[PDB]
Write a protein that binds this ligand. Structure first.
Ligand SMILES: CC(=O)N[C@@H]1[C@@H](O)[C@H](O)[C@@H](CO)O[C@H]1O
Ligand SMILES: CC(=O)N[C@@H]1[C@@H](O)[C@H](O)[C@@H](CO)O[C@H]1O
Ligand SMILES: CC(=O)N[C@@H]1[C@@H](O)[C@H](O)[C@@H](CO)O[C@H]1O
Ligand SMILES: *[C@@H]1O[C@H](CO)[C@@H](O)[C@H](O)[C@H]1NC(C)=O
Ligand SMILES: *[C@@H]1O[C@H](CO)[C@@H](O)[C@H](O)[C@H]1NC(C)=O
Ligand SMILES: *[C@@H]1O[C@H](CO)[C@@H](O)[C@H](O)[C@H]1NC(C)=O
Ligand SMILES: *[C@@H]1O[C@H](CO)[C@@H](O)[C@H](O)[C@H]1NC(C)=O
Ligand SMILES: *[C@@H]1O[C@H](CO)[C@@H](O)[C@H](O)[C@H]1NC(C)=O
Lengths: 32, 48, 329, 214, 49, 49, 48
């Protein structure tokens, strides 16, 4: 989890002209 | 191995026109373009 | 419009709908209380001088004047029927009373009425190519009217350049009276063969018919960049508000969203910031000078969940990413 | 009389605020590592050309230098702009001027003909950038402490615009003038800007950190 | 991107012009942005595959 | 292919036409060539996958 | 055949010689010192 980072993304890092990011159905806890 | 990209969706009408009713009216002349695009992106989202 | 279930039905273009979740609508709350802001400008610039002064220069040495730090009234201009020619290329005349331009250049000159056609973008001819050239992306309005009552007795003092070694670039001038080498034979001040004076006078005699008679011409150019303004329409400003979705106008630019005091330490020379998407995120008030942030009200995305219509008519609604405190609006 | 133009002489290209983001822009900028002329002030009044923009610099604490001449010919026949660092207030004006051979401020003399308008407003280095943009003569200025004896300080520093003058007069040449202790009428660094594409790194507080020449 | 339009800010077009020409300018913007969305969506399908 | 333009030789339009009408014609030709490249790079992506 | 002819036509003597499918320059008459009048209206002579 510490290796992959989104610090260089745009909207993914961050209203923004209708763009939207939906959460996955499975969160990281149940995947774990 | 990658498993699933981040699910994304876009409001075609508001994105293209930014709530401009005049632009929306002009966009109506193109037909179902926004519906088809939304459909495709939704399919991808379900695929994730 | 009856209810979300009905909306889902007409979205899927079917009466029956099976169990599932359907992206179907966007609830963009976006209330719009009207607010506007501009600086404390009251000095009316000398528009009448450029449009009513008796002394006007000729097209080969067209006058240039800068208009700034002034209130602008365009109703007086387009309502004045005296302007036989009135055209615009980058802005509609009615909208001029609502915008701000950051600077205005007022050009004026006199020409024969038949030559009025050359004053426009993309035009050609001696007037356009050798006396007064407009850029192809000109942003302003061209105004002209018959001037036989003033520029006609003939009034040979009005001169026009006929030729030059090359066509003039936009807003250029060339008052060089050096005789043109109109051929292979060189010359030094000799007005002989293939060596003619660069300018000629107009036969502005009142005996000539309309079109041939002199027409006065005025051209306005707008520096549309909007960081400084100080040049705004006659419309009055009003008191701003905070934390409410309002249609806002500052120095002519406009948008819609929520307003809040900006913590960003803008430098004194700055007026407004831009985000990753190049959209305005904060702005400097043109009356109090404080900086206030700008943010859209909400994504508004809405989806409907429901079991099969065969099974039941009950439905529930999901507001995508919206905080429950704001959904009642 | 020559030295390396280190990474400095950067200015805010626009009044738009940006912070903690990288941005690209195309504008006139003297490139990095270029040549800059140094003059034999150590112990004749000089004159220099103005191509497109002139990058001035000089070490000053007591304000020995008192402004710059700007113009096309400097022949008392065409408008030329003058800046005077008067003790009460800085003064700017453009007029035809009876330019003497040594027009230095003897202490004050000056001239004026067919005036259009007027405007009024070594421990530390001061530098200025002059851009004769179409219809707008932009002025930029800086004032920061230094430790170098003669060489330009290698530390980066970029800064905001002083003022913009709408005349946009023909500027083909420019001259330098300062004040002398006595009045005796008798018959610093310089660089040239070029059009380049630059990448600007804005950080918190909107402050420009550094840049990279394309 | 302006796509040949006088400006990329739609509100400027709506405020600077009157509708009899703004529809044309808007049509140019519509074409450009629609093409961008089409390219983006197609690329997303391929990556999804 | 001219794509509805007066010709396909780019220099021909710029020779026979002045800048004002040349803009609309060259814009059409640009749109057509862009469309062709888009079709060319979309097929290549599919064939690469 | 006209600028160096040995006989010229009177005002009453109408003449219109046919010139076509040929290529010749006007520069000779444009720089002819004898041609005291080279006034043109339809196009600049340099466009020959
Ligand atoms: C073109 C123009 O400015 N004309 C004005 C005219 O409208 C006005 O009635 C008169 C009185 O000042 O002065 C002049
Ligand atoms: C889910 C979410 O964002 N909840 C917030 C909550 O933390 C905050 O206290 C409240 C104040 O209005 O607004 C809402
Ligand atoms: C003081 C001065 O230089 N005045 C000049 C004057 O000599 C000249 O006749 C006129 C025309 O440009 O412009 C002004
Ligand atoms: C405008 O005037 C008001 C008082 O009437 C004052 O509070 C405000 O600061 C002024 N703003 C400007 C930009 O002059
Ligand atoms: C719903 O469908 C079932 C069969 O799956 C049927 O038996 C039932 O009558 C239907 N109810 C209606 C018509 O809503
Ligand atoms: C800088 O000036 C020196 C002379 O002092 C010269 O030799 C050199 O070519 C110039 N240019 C550069 C890039 O050093
Ligand atoms: C400015 O003057 C110079 C001559 O000193 C001339 O070569 C140049 O073309 C002029 N440019 C302008 C702004 O007209
Ligand atoms: C911005 O940041 C520093 C610390 O991050 C702060 O102390 C200061 O107010 C600002 N510095 C500059 C150079 O603007």
């Amino acid at each position: 989890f510490n290796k992959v980072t989104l610090a260089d993304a745009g909207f993914i890092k961050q209203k923004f002209n209708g763009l939207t990011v939906l959460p996955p159905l499975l969160t990281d806890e149940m995947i774990a | 191995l990658p498993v699933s990209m981040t699910k994304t969706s876009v409001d075609c009408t508001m994105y293209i026109c930014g709530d401009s009713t005049e632009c929306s009216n002009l966009l109506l002349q193109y037909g179902s373009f926004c519906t088809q695009l939304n459909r495709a992106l939704t399919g991808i989202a379900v695929e994730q | 419009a009856l209810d979300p279930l009905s909306e889902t039905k007409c979205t899927l273009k079917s009466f029956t709908v099976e169990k599932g979740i359907y992206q179907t609508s966007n609830f963009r709350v976006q209330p719009t209380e009207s607010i506007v802001r501009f600086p404390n400008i009251t000095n009316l610039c000398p528009f009448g001088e450029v449009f009513n002064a008796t002394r006007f220069a000729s097209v080969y040495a067209w006058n240039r004047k800068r208009i700034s730090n002034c209130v602008a009234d365009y109703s007086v201009l387009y309502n004045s029927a005296s302007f036989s020619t009135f055209k615009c290329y980058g802005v509609s005349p009615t909208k001029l009373n609502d915008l701000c331009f950051t600077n205005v250049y007022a050009d004026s000159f006199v020409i024969r009425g038949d030559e009025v056609r050359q004053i426009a973008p993309g035009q050609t001819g001696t007037i356009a190519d050798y006396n007064y050239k407009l850029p192809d992306d000109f942003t302003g309005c061209v105004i002209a009217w018959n001037s036989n009552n003033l520029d006609s007795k003939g009034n040979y003092n009005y001169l026009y350049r006929l030729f030059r070694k090359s066509n003039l670039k936009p807003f250029e001038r060339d008052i060089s009276t050096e005789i043109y080498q109109a051929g292979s034979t060189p010359c030094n001040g000799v007005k002989g063969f293939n060596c003619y004076f660069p300018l000629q006078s107009y036969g502005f005699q009142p005996t000539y018919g309309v079109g041939y008679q002199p027409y006065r011409v005025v051209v306005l150019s707008f520096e549309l960049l909007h960081a400084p303004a100080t040049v705004c329409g006659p419309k009055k400003s009003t008191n701003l508000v905070k934390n409410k979705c309002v249609n806002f106008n500052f120095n002519g630019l406009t948008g819609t969203g929520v307003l809040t005091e900006s913590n960003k330490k803008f430098l004194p020379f700055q007026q407004f910031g831009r985000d990753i998407a190049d959209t305005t995120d904060a702005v400097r008030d043109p009356q109090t000078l404080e900086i206030l942030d700008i943010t859209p009200c909400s994504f508004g995305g809405v989806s409907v969940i429901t079991p099969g219509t065969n099974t039941s008519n009950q439905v529930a609604v999901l507001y995508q990413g919206v905080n429950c405190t704001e959904v009642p609006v | 009389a020559y030295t390396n133009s280190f990474t400095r002489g950067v200015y805010y290209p626009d009044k738009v605020f940006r912070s903690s983001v990288l941005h690209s822009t195309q504008d006139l900028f003297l490139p990095f590592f270029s040549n800059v002329t140094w003059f034999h002030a150590i112990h004749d009044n000089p004159v220099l050309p103005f191509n497109d923009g002139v990058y001035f610099a000089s070490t000053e604490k007591s304000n020995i230098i008192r402004g710059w001449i700007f113009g096309t010919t400097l022949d008392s026949k065409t408008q030329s702009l003058l800046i005077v660092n008067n003790a009460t207030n800085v003064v700017i004006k453009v007029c035809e001027f009876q330019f003497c051979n040594y027009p230095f401020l003897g202490v004050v003399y000056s001239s004026a003909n067919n005036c259009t308008f007027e405007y009024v407003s070594f421990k530390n280095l001061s530098e200025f950038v002059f851009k004769n943009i179409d219809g707008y003569f932009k002025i930029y200025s800086k004032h920061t402490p230094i430790n170098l004896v003669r060489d330009l300080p290698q530390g980066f520093s970029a800064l905001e615009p002083l003022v913009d003058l709408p005349i946009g007069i023909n500027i083909t040449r420019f001259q330098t003038l300062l004040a002398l202790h006595r009045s005796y009428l008798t018959p610093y660094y310089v660089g040239y800007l070029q059009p380049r594409t630059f990448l600007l790194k804005y950080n918190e507080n909107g402050t420009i950190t550094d840049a990279v020449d394309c | 991107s302006n796509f040949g339009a006088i400006s990329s800010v739609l509100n400027d077009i709506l405020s600077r012009l009157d509708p009899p020409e703004a529809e044309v300018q808007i049509d140019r913007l519509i074409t450009g942005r629609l093409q961008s969305l089409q390219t983006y969506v197609t690329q997303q399908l391929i990556r999804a595959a």
